[model samples]
Target chain A: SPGIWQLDCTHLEGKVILVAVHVASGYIEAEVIPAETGQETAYFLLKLAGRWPVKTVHTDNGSNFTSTTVKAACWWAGIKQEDGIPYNPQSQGVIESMNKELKKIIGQVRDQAEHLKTAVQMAVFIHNHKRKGYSAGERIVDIIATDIQ
Target chain B: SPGIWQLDCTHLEGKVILVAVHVASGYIEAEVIPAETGQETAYFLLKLAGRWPVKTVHTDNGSNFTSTTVKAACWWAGIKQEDGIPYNPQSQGVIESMNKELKKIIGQVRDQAEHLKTAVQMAVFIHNHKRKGYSAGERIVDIIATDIQ
Candidate 1:
């Protein structure tokens, strides 16, 4: 149940949005970075592992995600990399939907907060707490109650 | 307060998403269209008028919006068109944010609903009733209690 996670990177207004979701609970975590790079990707992965048990990460085979640094990070963290099939976007449906919601929340947060980082934090919190049928139609907070420390 | 509105069209997955917002109240209405054209835009505008008062609509100087059919629809409905300045994306900020949210909801809806139109309807309903400071940190439903019919 806590074994699989999907991750992806998207851009908005010259910034990179990194989103990761726990496959079983549908809990999401996101951060805003200046660019897409292996360093940032690894950093986000490490942070995610700290909060939840990241057993295996499924992601597109983009250069940054496939870099040696990322491979090392996964190795050190005891996480397995499931390189999503190359050239097939449909496999990324989960992360793609998450990217869409993240962008939307970022746009809404822009009208209130002055910084993009605030939007990133708010989006993750909102998504995790949102009530959806993702886990029996309840909020991820309840769905992941046992999944999270 | 119910005078100014912003309208915009965006494309996603080979379909057109028409979004309209009541500026003061932050009430949003959206629809999925096969394509952008005067006939469709006019029909949407007229439908919007049926639900809420049609006063002034601000839109980009796109051909579909400036077509004779749209012009006649605005004239017959006693609605005035405010031609947004050409090449100025900032002026459409409000509608753009709404577009972001609409797209996000559409992606989420795709997980459950079979049709894009269902996503369009769901997004509009969710935005209109969402609690936000756009109107004193309250839901648009409360802000536009008197604004809607």
Candidate 2:
């Protein structure tokens, strides 16, 4: 399984939603961060490093990701950073689409959930386990679990 | 592993969607039936039989499920039909909530998909694999697969 991951951020209810999509298995890791900042994004990656072999992280030319703190964290974690074109978010197709769908799923969950943090966690869990649209009956959680085992 | 499943139907874009939710694992089987007829529902159950050990099918007191055709089919398949109280969908809590979520997911998928049939199938696939809200991290597909194996 590819250890490459695509990282991105989206805003929901005034909070920053940090998302990482596993390129091969479509597994997702997401959290509701206080702000879109290098410090927060860096820590999130650090946390992810414990769960999977995050060989490389791909992101757009966003200041938060390109900031010194994020770079330092990646270097410390032995992770390579691949920066996408400055104005070309479409180039990050996998995560861009995932962000859009995550927002929608979060919105739906929020309607019945009381807290945004819990709602986001629930949404991410749901997205990670959901079957990929392109695949034939394969699921992200199943694939990742098998790979890790 | 319980062989009990809760069956329900929801309408989407002029199509009838048949859904069966496994009671224990939340594993879902859904399809876009041409009509909400007894024959269609029975055939859907027949299809599910090949995929899972369906010993009992629980449904609301709808004619489609209570019809002679469905009863005969269940008898032939050696499956028991458990009928819920009329107009008491809340009693079928597990599947009632699943149907509500399924409709929202189908709507989200339909926005990008052309065919309603494929959209419903995709929605069911997503739901079956999504982590259950009540569970910590266990997903429906994982539990069912392990049990079936």
Candidate 3:
């Protein structure tokens, strides 16, 4: 059975921050840290499971994920952290597509002179409910089980 | 009659363009010129009357209107170009009010992630027909003709 996973970064204060998204469930998780380094990568792995167990986590080969801290965290949790090859974004395709969609929506709102926070919230809400995923050919809610078994 | 007008500058590149709108009627008239000069002011004055005779032309007191050319043109057209005090825009109450209304409608469309041009058109349309004016006690069209004639 396939499970949910994704990793990317969003901009905050002129820096790229890490974001992990569950494509199958349309669940988004984000973090604002200095850089995408090894320590930060480990922090993301530990924080992502925040009381919720994930079987597999997929990400790109950023310094953070490649760092020993992240590898140690994943090894301890008994979770597999799969890293995609460099220069190929298609490996984590779902989240990449979502990033583009989210950016477009956020850009429109910003251009229209809306507050950043409001625009982000609106984009997230719309993406979660209104937008349909091409992979599953269905809305995220419809395809994913609501209850966490 | 009070109306909002759409100003287009796509045709006249490198020119200072302006659109004069009647707040009540939503009637729009546009003027384009090489620069924002007194001559341009005169051109707008003539254009305004050609579209519909205007009793009062409300604007910011930029250098263009203060020039001799604009003054002479206003005198010839028998049109009053009312200028708000420097750094204070509240005096030209009606047009300022209209600007705010237009911006709000545009902002909503922008939040919906619509194209800017489409949003502006939609906003102008809604402002004209749907919005009610306080002075008229009804839609702008109802009172425009009464005041114009």
Candidate 4:
């Protein structure tokens, strides 16, 4: 397994959008927030409450990923925290896949002034639910929905 | 044996920035415009003056890439474009490497407001110059410098 892949942000229409992707399943989760790193644990944990919270998170090595709050926040959370190979990001190919998929999604809208957030969320929705066959195994939502609350 | 690659814009801080990457050398070029699509031909041609413009361009199959303008734009230039395999993006892994490498450069600054353009350009400069060893062959600048201006 490539492990839980990179967590990063993409800038679109002046807002910072955070995206977390499953390495094996092509499952995507994202948020459009005023800030990205500081709130990731919170949003991640909230998502965890609904979806499956795996053991480790392999993300970029940065102030945000290493923040005291995230350290403590994620401490109460699942488990391990790992960063991507510094400089050579192509190693984190999975998250890169997610970003490319996201760009192709938003590329259709071109540019949006305000509702870019909604557009991104909708893309995430379709990517998660509608877009399929990237893998043959059980999907993330199905796995999460099949198990706990 | 491969051709140089052209990347489309990523909208950030209220502007659009373009990137062109060399497939073999890993050398990169970029520009920040307070603009979008129809202008790509002019912007792309200007950059080609500095580097080796390839005979083939494999980019997104979108408006900026699919329109008659890009066709006419690429015509006098000599080219063929290969779109990403449907539902599969990793095949266009070279430009994806360019974007990932490009994102990691700008990711350090968090999200900038106005000077984001400068940050993007600086990232492209450092990436082209500082991040070396990708190629044992001549660097793009050296190769381009020895020949046409």
Q: Model 3 chain A — which ten-residue stretch has the worst lDDT?
A: A133-142
lDDT of 1 by residue, B1-149 (tens): 55566787889888988877666666666678998888778767755553344579876457855699888667755689877663566656756776787788768767644567655654554555455633311332333333432
Candidate 3 interface CA RMSD, Å: 25.5
Clashing pairs in 4: none
User: Candidate 2 chain A, which ten residues in sequence have the lowest lDDT sum?
Assistant: A132-141
Give the TM-scores of the predictions, in the order they appear: 0.45, 0.45, 0.38, 0.41
Q: Give candidate 4's error at residue B111 in angstroms.
A: 32
Candidate No. with top lDDT: 2
lDDT of 4 by residue, B1-149 (tens): 33546555566667776765555556655666777665454436422421233556655547666667666545534566555343555546655666776778777644531356546654654465453543312354334333322
Over B1-149, each residue of candidate 2 has an lDDT whose tens digit, in order, gives 45777787877777788777676766666677778888677656654553345688886447955698788657645678877553565546756677888889878767644667656655654564454453312444455435444
Which one wins on DockQ? Answer: 2
Order the candidates by TM-score, highest first — what do you get? 2, 1, 4, 3
Instruction: Quote model 2's TM-score for chain B.
Output: 0.80
lDDT of 1 by residue, A40-97 (tens): 7876675555334467998645685568877865775568977766356665676677
| Global Cα lDDT for candidate 2 | 0.65
Q: What is the TM-score of chain A alone in each candidate?
A: 0.81, 0.80, 0.64, 0.72
Off by over 4 Å in 4: A1-5, A86-90, A109-114, A130-138, A141-149, B1-149
The sequence of per-residue lDDT tens digits that candidate 2 reaches over residues A1-149 is 45677787888888888877776766677778888788777767755653345778876447855699888768755678877553565646756677888888878768645667656765665565455453312344445435444
Cα displacement (angstroms), candidate 3, residue B137, comes to 58
- Please give me the DockQ of candidate 1 compared with the native complex: 0.01
DockQ of each: 0.01, 0.03, 0.01, 0.01
Each prediction's RMSD over C-alphas, in Å, is 18.1, 16.3, 20.8, 20.5
Per-residue error at A2 for model 2, in Å? 18
Off by over 4 Å in 1: A1-149, B86-90, B133-149
